[PDB]
Short mmCIF file of C-alpha atoms and ligand atoms in Angstrom, two decimals:
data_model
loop_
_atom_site.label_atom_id
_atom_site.label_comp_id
_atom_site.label_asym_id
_atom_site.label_seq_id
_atom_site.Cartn_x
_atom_site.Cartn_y
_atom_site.Cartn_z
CA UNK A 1 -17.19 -21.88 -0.29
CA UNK A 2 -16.28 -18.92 1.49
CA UNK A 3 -14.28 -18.82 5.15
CA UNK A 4 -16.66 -16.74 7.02
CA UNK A 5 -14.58 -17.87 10.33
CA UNK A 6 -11.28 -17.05 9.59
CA UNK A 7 -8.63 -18.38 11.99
CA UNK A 8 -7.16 -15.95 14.96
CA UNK A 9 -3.97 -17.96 13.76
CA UNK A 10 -2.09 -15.70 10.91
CA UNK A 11 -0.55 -17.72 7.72
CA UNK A 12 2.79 -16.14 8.77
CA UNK A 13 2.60 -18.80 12.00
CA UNK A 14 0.98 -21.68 10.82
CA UNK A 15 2.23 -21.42 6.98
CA UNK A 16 -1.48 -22.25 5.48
CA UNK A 17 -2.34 -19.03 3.11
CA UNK A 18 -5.87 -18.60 2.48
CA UNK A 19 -6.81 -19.06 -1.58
CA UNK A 20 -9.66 -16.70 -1.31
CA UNK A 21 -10.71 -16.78 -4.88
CA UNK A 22 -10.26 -20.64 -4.65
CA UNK A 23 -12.76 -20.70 -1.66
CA UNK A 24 -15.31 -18.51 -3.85
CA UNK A 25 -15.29 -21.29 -6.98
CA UNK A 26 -13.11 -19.79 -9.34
CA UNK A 27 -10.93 -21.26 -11.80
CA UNK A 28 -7.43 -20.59 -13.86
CA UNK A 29 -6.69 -18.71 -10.55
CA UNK A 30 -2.82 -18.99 -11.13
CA UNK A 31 -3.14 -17.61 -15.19
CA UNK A 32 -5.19 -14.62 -14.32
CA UNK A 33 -2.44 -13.39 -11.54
CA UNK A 34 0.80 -14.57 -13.72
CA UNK A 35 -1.30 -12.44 -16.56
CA UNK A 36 -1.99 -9.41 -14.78
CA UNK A 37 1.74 -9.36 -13.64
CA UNK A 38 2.69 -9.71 -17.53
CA UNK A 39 0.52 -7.02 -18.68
CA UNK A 40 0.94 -4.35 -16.31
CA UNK A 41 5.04 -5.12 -16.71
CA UNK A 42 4.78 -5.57 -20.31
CA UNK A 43 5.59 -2.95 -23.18
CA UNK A 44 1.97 -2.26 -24.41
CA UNK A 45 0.72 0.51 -23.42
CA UNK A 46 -2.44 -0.57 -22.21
CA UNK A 47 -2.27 -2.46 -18.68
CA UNK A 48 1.54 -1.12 -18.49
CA UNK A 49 2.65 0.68 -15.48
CA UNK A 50 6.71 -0.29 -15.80
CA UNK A 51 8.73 2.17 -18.04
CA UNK A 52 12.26 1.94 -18.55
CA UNK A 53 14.20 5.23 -17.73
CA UNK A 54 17.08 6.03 -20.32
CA UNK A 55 19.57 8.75 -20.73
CA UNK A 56 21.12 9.77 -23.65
CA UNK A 57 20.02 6.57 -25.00
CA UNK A 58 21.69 4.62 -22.25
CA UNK A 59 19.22 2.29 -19.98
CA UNK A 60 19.17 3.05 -16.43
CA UNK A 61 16.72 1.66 -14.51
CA UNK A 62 12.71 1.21 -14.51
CA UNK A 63 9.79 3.03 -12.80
CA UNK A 64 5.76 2.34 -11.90
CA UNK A 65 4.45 5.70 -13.97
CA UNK A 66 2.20 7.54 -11.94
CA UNK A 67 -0.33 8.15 -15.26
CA UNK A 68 -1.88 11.29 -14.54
CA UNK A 69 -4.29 13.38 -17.04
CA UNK A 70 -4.82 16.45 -15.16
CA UNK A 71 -1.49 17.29 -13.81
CA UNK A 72 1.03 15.63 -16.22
CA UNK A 73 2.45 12.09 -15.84
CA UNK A 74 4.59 11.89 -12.57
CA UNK A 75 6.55 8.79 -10.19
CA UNK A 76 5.38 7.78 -7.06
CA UNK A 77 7.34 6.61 -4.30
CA UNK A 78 4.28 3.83 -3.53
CA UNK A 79 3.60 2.92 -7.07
CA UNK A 80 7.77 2.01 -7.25
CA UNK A 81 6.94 0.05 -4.06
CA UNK A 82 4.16 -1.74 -4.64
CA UNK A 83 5.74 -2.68 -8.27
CA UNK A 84 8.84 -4.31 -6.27
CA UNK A 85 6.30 -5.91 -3.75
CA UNK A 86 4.56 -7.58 -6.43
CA UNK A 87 7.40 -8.51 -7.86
CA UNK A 88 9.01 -10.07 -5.40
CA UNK A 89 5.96 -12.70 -4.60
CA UNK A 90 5.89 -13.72 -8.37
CA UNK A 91 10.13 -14.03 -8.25
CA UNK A 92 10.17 -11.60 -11.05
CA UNK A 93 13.65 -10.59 -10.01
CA UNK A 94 14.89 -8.45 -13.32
CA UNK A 95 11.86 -5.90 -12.65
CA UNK A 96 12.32 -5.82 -9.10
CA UNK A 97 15.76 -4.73 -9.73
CA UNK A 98 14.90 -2.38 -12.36
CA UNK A 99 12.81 -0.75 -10.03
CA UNK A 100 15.34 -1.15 -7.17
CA UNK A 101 18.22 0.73 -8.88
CA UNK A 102 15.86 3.74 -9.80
CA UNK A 103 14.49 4.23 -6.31
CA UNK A 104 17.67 4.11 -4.94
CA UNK A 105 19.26 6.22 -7.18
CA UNK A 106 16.67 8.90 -8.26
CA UNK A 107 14.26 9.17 -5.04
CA UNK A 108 16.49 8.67 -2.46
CA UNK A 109 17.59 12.01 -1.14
CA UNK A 110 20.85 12.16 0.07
CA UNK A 111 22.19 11.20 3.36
CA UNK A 112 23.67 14.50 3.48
CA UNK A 113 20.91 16.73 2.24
CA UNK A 114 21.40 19.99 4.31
CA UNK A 115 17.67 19.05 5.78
CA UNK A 116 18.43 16.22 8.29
CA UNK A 117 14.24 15.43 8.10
CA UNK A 118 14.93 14.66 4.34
CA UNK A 119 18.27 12.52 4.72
CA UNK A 120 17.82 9.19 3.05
CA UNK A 121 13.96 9.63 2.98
CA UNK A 122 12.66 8.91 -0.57
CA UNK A 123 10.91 12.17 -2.36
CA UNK A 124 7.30 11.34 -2.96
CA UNK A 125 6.92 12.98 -6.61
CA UNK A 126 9.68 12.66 -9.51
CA UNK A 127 9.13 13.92 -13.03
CA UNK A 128 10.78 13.91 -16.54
CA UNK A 129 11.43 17.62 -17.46
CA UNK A 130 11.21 19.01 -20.63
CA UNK A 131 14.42 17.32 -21.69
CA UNK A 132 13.37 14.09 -20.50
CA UNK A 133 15.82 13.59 -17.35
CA UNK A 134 14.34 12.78 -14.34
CA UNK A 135 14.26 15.25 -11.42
CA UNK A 136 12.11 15.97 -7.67
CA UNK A 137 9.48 17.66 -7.72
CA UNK A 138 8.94 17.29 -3.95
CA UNK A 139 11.82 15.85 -1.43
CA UNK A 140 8.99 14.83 1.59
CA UNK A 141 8.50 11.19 1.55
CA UNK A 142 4.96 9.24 1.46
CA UNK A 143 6.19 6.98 4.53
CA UNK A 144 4.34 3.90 3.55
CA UNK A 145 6.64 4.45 0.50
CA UNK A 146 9.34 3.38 2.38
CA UNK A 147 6.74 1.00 4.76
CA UNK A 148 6.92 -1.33 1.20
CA UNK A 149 10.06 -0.89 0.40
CA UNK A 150 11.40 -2.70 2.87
CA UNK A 151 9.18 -5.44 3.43
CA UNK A 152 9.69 -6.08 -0.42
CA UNK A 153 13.47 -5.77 0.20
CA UNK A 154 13.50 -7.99 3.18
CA UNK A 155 11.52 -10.64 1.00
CA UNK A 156 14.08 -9.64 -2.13
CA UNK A 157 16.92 -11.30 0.79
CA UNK A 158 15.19 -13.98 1.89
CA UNK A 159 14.25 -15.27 -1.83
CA UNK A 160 17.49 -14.25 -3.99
CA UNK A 161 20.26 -14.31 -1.51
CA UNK A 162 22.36 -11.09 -1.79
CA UNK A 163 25.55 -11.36 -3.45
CA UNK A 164 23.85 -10.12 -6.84
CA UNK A 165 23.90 -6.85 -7.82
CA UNK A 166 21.82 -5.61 -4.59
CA UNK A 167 22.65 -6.67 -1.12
CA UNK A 168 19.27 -6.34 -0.38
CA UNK A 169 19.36 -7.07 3.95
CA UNK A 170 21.70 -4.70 3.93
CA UNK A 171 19.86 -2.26 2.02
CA UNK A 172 16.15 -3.16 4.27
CA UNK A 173 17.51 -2.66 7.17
CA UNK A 174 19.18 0.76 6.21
CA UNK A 175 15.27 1.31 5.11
CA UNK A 176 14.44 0.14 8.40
CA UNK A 177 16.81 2.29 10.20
CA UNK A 178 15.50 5.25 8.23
CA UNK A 179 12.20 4.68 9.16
CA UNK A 180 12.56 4.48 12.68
CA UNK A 181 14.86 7.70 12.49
CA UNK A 182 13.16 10.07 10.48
CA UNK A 183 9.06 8.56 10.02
CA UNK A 184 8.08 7.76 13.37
CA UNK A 185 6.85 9.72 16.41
CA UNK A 186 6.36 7.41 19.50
CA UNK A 187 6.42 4.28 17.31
CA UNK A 188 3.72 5.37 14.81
CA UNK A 189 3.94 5.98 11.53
CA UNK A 190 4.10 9.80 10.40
CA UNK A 191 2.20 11.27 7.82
CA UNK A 192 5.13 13.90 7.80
CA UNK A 193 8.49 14.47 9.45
CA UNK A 194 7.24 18.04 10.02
CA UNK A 195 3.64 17.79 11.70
CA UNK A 196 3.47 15.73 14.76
CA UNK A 197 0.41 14.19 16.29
CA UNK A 198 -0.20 12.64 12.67
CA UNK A 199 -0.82 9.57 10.88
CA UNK A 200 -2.37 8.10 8.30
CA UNK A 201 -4.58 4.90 8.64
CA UNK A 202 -3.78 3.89 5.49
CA UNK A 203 0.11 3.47 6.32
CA UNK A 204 -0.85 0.58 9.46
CA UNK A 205 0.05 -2.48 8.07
CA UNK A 206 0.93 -4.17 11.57
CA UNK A 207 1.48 -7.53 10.16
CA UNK A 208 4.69 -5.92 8.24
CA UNK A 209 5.71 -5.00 11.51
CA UNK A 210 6.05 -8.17 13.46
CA UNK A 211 8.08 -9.48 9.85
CA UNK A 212 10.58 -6.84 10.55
CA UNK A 213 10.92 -7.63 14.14
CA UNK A 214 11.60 -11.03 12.76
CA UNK A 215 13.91 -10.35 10.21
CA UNK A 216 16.25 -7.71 12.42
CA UNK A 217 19.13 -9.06 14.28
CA UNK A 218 19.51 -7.40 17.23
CA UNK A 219 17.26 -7.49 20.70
CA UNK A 220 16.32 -3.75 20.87
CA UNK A 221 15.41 -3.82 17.19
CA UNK A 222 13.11 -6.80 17.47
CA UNK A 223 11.66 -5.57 20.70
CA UNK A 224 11.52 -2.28 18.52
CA UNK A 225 9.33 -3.61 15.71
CA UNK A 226 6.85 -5.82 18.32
CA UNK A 227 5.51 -2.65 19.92
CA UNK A 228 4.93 -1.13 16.49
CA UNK A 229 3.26 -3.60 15.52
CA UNK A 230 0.92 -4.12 19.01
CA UNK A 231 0.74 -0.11 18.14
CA UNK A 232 -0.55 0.14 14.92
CA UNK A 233 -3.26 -2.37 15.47
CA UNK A 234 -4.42 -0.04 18.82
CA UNK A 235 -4.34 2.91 16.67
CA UNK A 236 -6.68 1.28 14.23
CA UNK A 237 -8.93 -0.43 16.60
CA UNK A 238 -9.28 3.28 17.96
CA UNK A 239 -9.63 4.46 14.64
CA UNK A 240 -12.46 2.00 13.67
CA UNK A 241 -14.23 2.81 17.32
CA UNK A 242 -14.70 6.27 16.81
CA UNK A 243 -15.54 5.87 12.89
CA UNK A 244 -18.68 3.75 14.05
CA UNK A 245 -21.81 4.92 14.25
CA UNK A 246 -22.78 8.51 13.85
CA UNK A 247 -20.84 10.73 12.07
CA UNK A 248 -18.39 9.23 10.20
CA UNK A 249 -20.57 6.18 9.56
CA UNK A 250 -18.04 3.75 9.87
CA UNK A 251 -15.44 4.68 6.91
CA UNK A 252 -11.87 5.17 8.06
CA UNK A 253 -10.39 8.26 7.28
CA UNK A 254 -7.33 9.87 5.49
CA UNK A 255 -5.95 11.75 8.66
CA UNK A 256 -5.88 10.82 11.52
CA UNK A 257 -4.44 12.10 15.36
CA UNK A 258 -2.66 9.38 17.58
CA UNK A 259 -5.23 8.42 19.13
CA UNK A 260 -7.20 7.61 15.99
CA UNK A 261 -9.54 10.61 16.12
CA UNK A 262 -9.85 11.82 12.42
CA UNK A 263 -8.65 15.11 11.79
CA UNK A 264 -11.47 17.71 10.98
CA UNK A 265 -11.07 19.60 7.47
CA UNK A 266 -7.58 21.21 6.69
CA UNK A 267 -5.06 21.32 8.88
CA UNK A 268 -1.69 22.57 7.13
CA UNK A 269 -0.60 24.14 3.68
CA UNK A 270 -0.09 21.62 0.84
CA UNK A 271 -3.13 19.31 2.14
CA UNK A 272 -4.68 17.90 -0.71
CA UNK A 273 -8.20 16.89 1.04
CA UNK A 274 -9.87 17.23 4.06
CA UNK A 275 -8.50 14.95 6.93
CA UNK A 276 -12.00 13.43 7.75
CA UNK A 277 -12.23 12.21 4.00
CA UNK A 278 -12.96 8.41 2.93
CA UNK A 279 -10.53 8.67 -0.20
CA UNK A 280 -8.11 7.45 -2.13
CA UNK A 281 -5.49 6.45 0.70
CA UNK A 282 -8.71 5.70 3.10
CA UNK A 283 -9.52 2.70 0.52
CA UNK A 284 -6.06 1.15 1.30
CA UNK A 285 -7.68 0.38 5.39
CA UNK A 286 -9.68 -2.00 4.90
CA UNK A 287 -6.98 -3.88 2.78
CA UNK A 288 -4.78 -3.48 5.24
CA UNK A 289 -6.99 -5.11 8.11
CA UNK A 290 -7.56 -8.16 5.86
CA UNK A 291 -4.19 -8.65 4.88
CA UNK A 292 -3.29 -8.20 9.00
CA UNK A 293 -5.78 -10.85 9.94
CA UNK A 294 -4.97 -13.35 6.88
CA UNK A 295 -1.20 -12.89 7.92
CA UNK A 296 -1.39 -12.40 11.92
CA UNK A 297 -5.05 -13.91 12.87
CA UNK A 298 -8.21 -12.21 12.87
CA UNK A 299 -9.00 -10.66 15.76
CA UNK A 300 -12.85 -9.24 16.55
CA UNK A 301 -11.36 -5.48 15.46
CA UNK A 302 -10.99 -6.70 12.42
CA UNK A 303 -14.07 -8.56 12.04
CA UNK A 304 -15.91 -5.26 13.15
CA UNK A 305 -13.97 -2.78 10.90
CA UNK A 306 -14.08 -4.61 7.51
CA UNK A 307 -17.98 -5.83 8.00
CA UNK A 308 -19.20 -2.45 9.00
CA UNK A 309 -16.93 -0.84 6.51
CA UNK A 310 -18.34 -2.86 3.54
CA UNK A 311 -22.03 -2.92 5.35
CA UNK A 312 -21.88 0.83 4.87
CA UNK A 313 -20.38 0.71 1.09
CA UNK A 314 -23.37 -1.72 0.23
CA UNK A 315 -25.81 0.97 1.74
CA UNK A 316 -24.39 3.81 0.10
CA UNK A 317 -24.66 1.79 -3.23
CA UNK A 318 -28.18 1.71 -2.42
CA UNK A 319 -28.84 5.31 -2.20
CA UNK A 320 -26.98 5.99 -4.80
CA UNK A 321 -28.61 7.36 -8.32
CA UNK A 322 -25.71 5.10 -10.09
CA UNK A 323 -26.25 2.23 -8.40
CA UNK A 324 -22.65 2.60 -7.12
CA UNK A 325 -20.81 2.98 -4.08
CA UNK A 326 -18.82 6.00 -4.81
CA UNK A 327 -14.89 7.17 -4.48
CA UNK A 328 -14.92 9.29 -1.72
CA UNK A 329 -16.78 10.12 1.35
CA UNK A 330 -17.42 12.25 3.89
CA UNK A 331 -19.22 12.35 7.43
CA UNK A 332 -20.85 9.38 5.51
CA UNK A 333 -22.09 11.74 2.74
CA UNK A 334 -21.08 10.88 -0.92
CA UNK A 335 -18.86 13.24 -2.51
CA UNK A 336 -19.87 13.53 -6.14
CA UNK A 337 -15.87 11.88 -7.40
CA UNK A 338 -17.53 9.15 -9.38
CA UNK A 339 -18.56 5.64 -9.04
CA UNK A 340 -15.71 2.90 -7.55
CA UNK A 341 -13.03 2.09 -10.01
CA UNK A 342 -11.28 -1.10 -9.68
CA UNK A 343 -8.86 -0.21 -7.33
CA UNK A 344 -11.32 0.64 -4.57
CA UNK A 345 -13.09 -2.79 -5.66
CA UNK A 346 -9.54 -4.71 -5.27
CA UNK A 347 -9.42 -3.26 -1.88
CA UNK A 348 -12.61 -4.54 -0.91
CA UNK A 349 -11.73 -7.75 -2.19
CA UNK A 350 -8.56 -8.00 -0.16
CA UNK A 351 -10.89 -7.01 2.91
CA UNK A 352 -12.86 -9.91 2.54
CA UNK A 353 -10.08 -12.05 4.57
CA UNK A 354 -11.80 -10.34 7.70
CA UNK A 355 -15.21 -10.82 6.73
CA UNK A 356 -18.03 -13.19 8.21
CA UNK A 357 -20.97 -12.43 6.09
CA UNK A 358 -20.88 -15.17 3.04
CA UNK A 359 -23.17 -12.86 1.45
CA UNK A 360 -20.86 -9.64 1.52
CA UNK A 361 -18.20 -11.66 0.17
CA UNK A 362 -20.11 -13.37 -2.69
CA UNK A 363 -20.77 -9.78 -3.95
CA UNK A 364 -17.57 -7.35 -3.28
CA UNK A 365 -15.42 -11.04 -4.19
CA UNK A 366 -17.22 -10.82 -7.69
CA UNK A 367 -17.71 -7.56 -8.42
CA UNK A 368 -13.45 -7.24 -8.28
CA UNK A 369 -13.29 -10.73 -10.36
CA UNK A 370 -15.67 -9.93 -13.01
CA UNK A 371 -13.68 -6.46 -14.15
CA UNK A 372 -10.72 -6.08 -16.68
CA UNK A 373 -7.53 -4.98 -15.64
CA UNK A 374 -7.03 -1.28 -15.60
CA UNK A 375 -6.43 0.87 -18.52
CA UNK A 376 -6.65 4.11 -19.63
CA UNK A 377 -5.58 7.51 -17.89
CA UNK A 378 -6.39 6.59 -14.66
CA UNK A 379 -4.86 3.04 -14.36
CA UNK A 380 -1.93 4.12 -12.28
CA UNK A 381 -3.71 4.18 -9.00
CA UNK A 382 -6.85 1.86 -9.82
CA UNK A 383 -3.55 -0.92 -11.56
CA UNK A 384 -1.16 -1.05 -9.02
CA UNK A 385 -4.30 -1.79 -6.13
CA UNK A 386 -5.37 -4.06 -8.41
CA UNK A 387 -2.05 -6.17 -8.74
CA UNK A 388 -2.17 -5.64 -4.95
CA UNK A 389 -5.09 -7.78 -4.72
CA UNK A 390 -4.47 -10.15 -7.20
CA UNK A 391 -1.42 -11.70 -5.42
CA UNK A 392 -3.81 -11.42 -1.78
CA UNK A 393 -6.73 -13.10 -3.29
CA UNK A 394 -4.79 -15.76 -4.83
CA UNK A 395 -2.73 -16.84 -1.64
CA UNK A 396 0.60 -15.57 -3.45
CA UNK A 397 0.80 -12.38 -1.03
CA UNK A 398 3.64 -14.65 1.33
CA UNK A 399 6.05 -13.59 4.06
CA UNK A 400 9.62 -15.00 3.24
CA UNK A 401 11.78 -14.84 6.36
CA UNK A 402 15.59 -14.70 6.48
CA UNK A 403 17.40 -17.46 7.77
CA UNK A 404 20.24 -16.29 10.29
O1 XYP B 501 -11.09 5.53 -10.63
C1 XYP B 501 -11.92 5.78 -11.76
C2 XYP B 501 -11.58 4.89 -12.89
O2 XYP B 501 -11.85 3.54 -12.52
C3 XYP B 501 -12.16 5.28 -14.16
O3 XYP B 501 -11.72 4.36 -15.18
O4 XYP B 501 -12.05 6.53 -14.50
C4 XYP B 501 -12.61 7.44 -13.55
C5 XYP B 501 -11.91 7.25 -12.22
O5 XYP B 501 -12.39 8.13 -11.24
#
């Protein structure tokens, strides 16, 4: 049966990880996450998200393809992250270094790029040209990019050891460093090195946090990591407190100020949506608060944000002509940008860890266990949330801690 009390104490102190689909009945658990690994990192064309990247014939490295109908296929700096992630808690080690080598080779800009903002940040958007060679389309980072990267790489350490071909410590904690350098402002994540009093809710993942401070070896750098952490979960409690209630009918948002406020409409050149949108990073929040309480202990914040989150989802699928809970909102309003694909259900799912009501599990639990993996043109995004969950929802989703 479901856990509708889960325990203030995190799996990353006690070391008992929740099963979540074992608690909800479900069986051949294990098969259905090995399988979803094997098809979305298999050659078929179908589930697949992991290309290899040749030149000339010559094999390079691998990539998470960033599948993308109306704008041309592209690669992601938080697909390639959340490939290695997975990876690493299945110890699939050859596709974690495929993916490894190509991040660090092809969206790392240089350490010397005449833009000190941009040095050793990793550009958000990479493309094939015409020729087929891989190039930037755009040098800014999407921080929670690097965020992943090195928590995977951290885990990469811990599991592998590092006299392979990556010394992966060495390489997380030159993530780390870059982070802290070039992505914060007053220990919070940035949305951009060039707009300040910015962030983006779905980049908190405080439990990461506290595993860096852990897995640093120096006192100011532990110390460092600890007040992110106590900082990210203020900045969403915030957030959550003034999404409640009336009018932004408590959805997190894709922008947001310090202070969690959400940022109202546009707000610089390049945005893609409106700040005070429920969207396609907003659906990440809610995942994020249930794997922070599964991990670090469930607090009442989290309790509150995931149960009126979902209690509002489950109302909107009632007024809704599709009998849906839809993609994207705003000011609690539906947008018209279609019914929930399977990534927004996976987040859900992976909420679900905060949640009390049996009843709210029992339906957002099976409505992500009764789908199909992703395919088709829009299986980049809906795919790689969906692997996401499959690893949370199964207890593999672990924290592996150096040894020093
Ligand atoms: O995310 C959605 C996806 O699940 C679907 O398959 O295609 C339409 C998308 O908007």
């Amino acid at each position: 049966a479901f856990n509708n009390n889960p325990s203030s104490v995190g799996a990353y102190s006690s070391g008992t990880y929740r099963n979540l689909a074992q608690e909800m009945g479900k069986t051949n658990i294990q098969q259905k996450v090995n399988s979803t690994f094997d098809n979305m990192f298999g050659y078929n064309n179908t589930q697949q998200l992991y290309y290899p990247y040749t030149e000339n014939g010559v094999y390079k490295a691998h990539y998470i393809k960033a599948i993308n109908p109306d704008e041309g296929d592209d690669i992601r700096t938080e697909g390639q992250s959340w490939g290695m992630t997975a990876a690493v808690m299945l110890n699939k080690q050859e596709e974690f270094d495929n993916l490894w080598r190509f991040a660090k080779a092809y969206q790392k800009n240089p350490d010397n790029h005449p833009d000190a903002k941009k040095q050793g940040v990793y550009a958000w958007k990479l493309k094939l040209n015409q020729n087929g060679f891989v190039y930037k389309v755009d040098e800014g980072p999407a921080p929670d990019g690097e965020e992943y990267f090195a928590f995977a790489l951290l885990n990469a350490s811990a599991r592998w050891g590092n006299s392979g071909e990556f010394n992966y410590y060495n390489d997380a904690i030159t993530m780390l460093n870059t982070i802290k350098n070039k992505l914060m402002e007053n220990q919070i994540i940035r949305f951009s090195p060039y707009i300040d009093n910015l962030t983006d809710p779905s980049y908190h993942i405080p439990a990461f946090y506290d595993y860096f401070a852990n897995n640093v070896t120096n006192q100011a750098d532990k110390n460092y990591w600890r007040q992110v952490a106590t900082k990210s979960r203020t900045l969403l409690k915030n957030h959550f407190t003034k999404v409640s209630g009336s009018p932004h009918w408590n959805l997190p948002t894709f922008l947001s100020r310090l202070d969690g406020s959400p940022v109202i409409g546009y707000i610089f050149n390049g945005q893609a949506n409106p700040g005070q949108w429920y969207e396609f990073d907003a659906w990440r929040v809610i995942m994020n608060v249930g794997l922070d309480a599964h991990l670090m202990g469930a607090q009442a914040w989290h309790k509150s944000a995931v149960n009126k989150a979902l209690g509002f989802l489950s109302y909107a699928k009632t007024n809704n002509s599709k009998n849906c809970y839809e993609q994207v909102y705003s000011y609690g309003g539906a947008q018209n940008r279609g019914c929930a694909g399977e990534g927004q259900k996976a987040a859900n799912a992976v909420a679900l860890l905060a949640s009390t009501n049996a009843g709210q599990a029992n339906e957002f639990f099976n409505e992500f266990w009764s789908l199909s993996q992703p395919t088709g043109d829009y299986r980049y995004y809906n795919g790689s949330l969906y692997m996401l969950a499959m690893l949370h929802v199964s207890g593999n989703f672990k924290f592996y801690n150096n040894t020093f």
